Amino acid sequence: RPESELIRQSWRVVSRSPLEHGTVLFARLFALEPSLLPLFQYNGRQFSSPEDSLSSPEFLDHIRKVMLVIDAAVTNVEDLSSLEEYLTSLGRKHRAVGVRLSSFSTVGESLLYMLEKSLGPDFTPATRTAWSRLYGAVVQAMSRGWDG
Numbered sequence: 001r002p003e004s005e006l007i008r009q010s011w012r013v014v015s016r017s018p019l020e021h022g023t024v025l026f027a028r029l030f031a032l033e034p035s036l037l038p039l040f041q042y043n044g045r046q047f048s049s050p051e052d053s054l055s056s057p058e059f060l061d062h063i064r065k066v067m068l069v070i071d072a073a074v075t076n077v078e079d080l081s082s083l084e085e086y087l088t089s090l091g092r093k094h095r096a097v098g099v100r101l102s103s104f105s106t107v108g109e110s111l112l113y114m115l116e117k118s119l120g121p122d123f124t125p126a127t128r129t130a131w132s133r134l135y136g137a138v139v140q141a142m143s144r145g146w147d148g
């Protein structure tokens, strides 16, 4: 598949510095959907502003977790069936913390923003399409965690 190669090559750029890039992803996410901020409750306390989240070690560890799951999807781009049961359970976990299924479209747009800004002119419409399809497949598997 030509799409598989566009994903592996663009990911190579991002995965060199995962926290710096995941920081961009989450900064964009809170700019688009501020109501996601209170869902990160560590020690039963809420962040007041988005910049508060960037000083939290637990929050930064969640950024690392996110980037590792994407890395697993990229590594298995030819065979995403192998990640399916793990992703369903990851969906169930997020449902339990209070994430709505609709918020996964915002996450997808923030991922595309982070790729666009990192790759610049190397972010071609073919690259955008490849990532949209991969992200779509990941979301389909996770959405099984919301009962169906």
Ligand code: HEM
Pocket (backbone or CB within 6 Å): 036, 039, 040, 041, 058, 061, 062, 065, 066, 067, 069, 070, 090, 093, 094, 097, 099, 103, 104, 107
């Ligand atoms: C709407 C955006 C999201 C919110 C509000 C959110 C919130 C959380 C919270 C509160 C936890 C538990 C505390 C913690 O482990 O830090 C968590 C766990 C986790 N999240 Fe997220 N998350 C979001 C998106 C994602 C995405 C897109 C991925 C990966 C693709 C991801 C991967 C994980 C992983 C791997 C865990 C640990 C699950 C476990 O094994 O218990 N999360 N999420």
